[PDB]
Design a protein around this ligand. Structure first.
Ligand SMILES: [Zn+2]
Length: 31
């Protein structure tokens, strides 16, 4: 589905589904 992770903004997925290491502002993708 069209859900551009507005958190990391490096892929489409849910925040909780964000499997990225870091996110915007280079934040540590929290659990
Ligand atoms: Zn993400």
């Amino acid at each position: 589905p069209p859900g551009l992770c507005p958190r990391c903004k490096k892929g489409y997925h849910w925040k909780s589904e964000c499997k990225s290491k870091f996110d915007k502002d280079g934040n540590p993708l929290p659990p």
